[PDB]
């Protein structure tokens, strides 16, 4: 029997009209002993409000119970503190986990994009690049656009941590050759806390 | 109980002859009541008997870790040899068996390609240089970065990122004083993989 906490996902947060949510994840419960309970707290008072939604039967004969609390935007980005408390039989104490946003102040990305070099031209398709960098914490979200509508044949790296404390990290979106040669305009979007309005984007077009 | 942990070679020691790749078998949580721990290792399923067996180091918390090192030759590695340790502890109901070995699939000849700094980049002090590596299986592999000759300190590169075909991608990123790239200083982006002609190519970056 065990226990994982996880975070809302940043775009979550960062979108009023979004709900965020933690979610607390129990594995490793046995046909014996059902009946795991839950127990969550902000800031040490407790609340009421989570749901549990119907368990799994697992291939290896387990169970797997889930537990999901909304949470306030204005809540999370202050640092306020979520904590998970489990209880079974089998365990022999109660289980605490702990969540929370980074500490420390928060800094705005840099956002560049890059056309693709010059020895990629030969091939029947390009990528273009978007270097995210400087920014804290790491909880950020990048999608792509061009016309309006969204592009969705790109992908991000994880998050990496930089040599002065702050993060970076890169999305690559690849497109035909021959939308970029016809001076199509492709956009990096890019959502993080420091940002004024929370929301910034760079375009990228061969002109 | 005693847990068992097996570490694979690294990236830049199976594709250089030179260099000595290594297996690692480590277990830990091993008691004080019966600290004995017997190691053997197979390739392919046949015994080898070539592995080095540190001595057992006790640790703060009462418990014992034991370590055995196997040499390997680095075709037996790019061939796809699985290599099999395995672990006897009379506080074990039975033997734990660990195997790794590299990953399955084809081989894929890495894309490098160096970016210079974005224009609105250079009202900075310092300037990123990128280069982006991209088709290359399997992820095993080693990025560096030089000038004139003579490595490169300030770069930091991402773990690879699995590409919509299959494949694996990464961007390393060197950050240099802007005066030092104006300056016309030529930077060189180095890849090390099994599919590349001598495991080994390189990618220049200047003004000009
Ligand atoms: C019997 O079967 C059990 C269940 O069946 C599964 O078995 C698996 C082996 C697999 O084969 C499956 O086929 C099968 O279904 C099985 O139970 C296993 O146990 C594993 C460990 O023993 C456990 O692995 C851990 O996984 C977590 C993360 O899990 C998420 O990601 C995986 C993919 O990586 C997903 O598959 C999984 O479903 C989880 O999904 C994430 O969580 C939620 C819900 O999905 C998402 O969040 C919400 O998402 C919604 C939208 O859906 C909203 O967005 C909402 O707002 C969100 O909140 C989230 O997005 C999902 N993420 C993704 C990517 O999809 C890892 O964290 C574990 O890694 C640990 O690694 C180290 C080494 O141990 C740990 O130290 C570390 O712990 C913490 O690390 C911190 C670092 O900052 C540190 O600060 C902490 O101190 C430290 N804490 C501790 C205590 O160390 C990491 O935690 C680990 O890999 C499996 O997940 C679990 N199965 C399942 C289904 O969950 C049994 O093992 C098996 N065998 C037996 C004998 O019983
Ligand atoms: C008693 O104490 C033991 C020693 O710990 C010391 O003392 C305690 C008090 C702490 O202060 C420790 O910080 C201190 O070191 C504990 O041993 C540890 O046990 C845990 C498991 O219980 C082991 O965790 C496993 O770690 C794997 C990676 O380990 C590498 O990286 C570690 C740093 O991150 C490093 O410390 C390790 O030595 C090891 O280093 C590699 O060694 C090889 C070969 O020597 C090299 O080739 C590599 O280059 C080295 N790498 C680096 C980065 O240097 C994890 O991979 C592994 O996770 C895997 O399995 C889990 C499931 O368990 C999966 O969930 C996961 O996804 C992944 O697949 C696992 O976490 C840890 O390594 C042990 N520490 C040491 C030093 O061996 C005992 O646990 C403790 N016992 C009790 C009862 O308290």
Redesign the pocket.
């Known amino acids: 029997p065990?226990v994982?906490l996880?975070?809302?996902?940043p775009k979550?947060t960062l979108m009023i009209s979004r709900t965020?949510?933690?979610?607390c994840?129990v594995?490793?419960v046995s046909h014996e002993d059902p009946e795991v309970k839950f127990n969550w707290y902000v800031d040490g008072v407790e609340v009421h409000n989570a749901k549990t939604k119907p368990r799994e039967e697992?291939?290896?004969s387990?169970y797997?119970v889930?537990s999901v609390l909304t949470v306030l935007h204005q809540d999370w980005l202050n640092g306020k503190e979520y904590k998970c408390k489990v209880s079974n039989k089998a365990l022999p104490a109660p289980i605490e986990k702990t969540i929370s946003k980074a500490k420390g102040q928060p800094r705005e990305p840099q956002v560049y994009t890059l056309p693709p070099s010059r020895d990629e031209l030969t091939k029947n398709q390009v990528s273009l690049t978007c270097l995210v960098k400087g920014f804290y914490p790491s909880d950020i979200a990048v999608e792509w656009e061009s016309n309006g509508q969204p592009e969705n044949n790109y992908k991000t790296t994880p998050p990496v941590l930089d040599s002065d404390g702050s993060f970076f990290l890169y999305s690559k979106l690849t497109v035909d050759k021959s939308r970029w040669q016809q001076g199509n305009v492709f956009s990096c979007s890019v959502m993080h806390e420091a940002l004024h309005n929370h929301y910034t984007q760079k375009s990228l077009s061969l002109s």
């Open positions: 065990s994982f996880f975070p809302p996902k979550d965020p949510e933690v979610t994840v594995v490793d697992q291939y290896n387990t797997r889930v």
